[PDB]
Amino acid sequence: GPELYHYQECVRGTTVLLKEPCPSGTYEGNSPFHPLADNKFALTCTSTHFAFACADGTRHTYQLRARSVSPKLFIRQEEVQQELYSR
16 A cells, blocks of 8 residues: 655654544554553653554655754754765
8 A cells, every 4th residue: 555654753762643544454663562542552752763664555655853851953964864865
């Protein structure tokens, strides 16, 4: 099916409350999955990427953009780099 790549930005260390895109879906990732109230899943805001495969077949990929203590940085190579142009 289609691959709907999504991204979410959160400060590195906190807990995101990602709204469940589709009922009864497959959580694809190494990150923790925690079904929260009102169809959500709590995740540690960090630089990772997971995916949500819905019963429809829709693949909703999910990038997590950990905003460090300095969410600007720009230390020679963008904010942090190696998460963008690492080749």
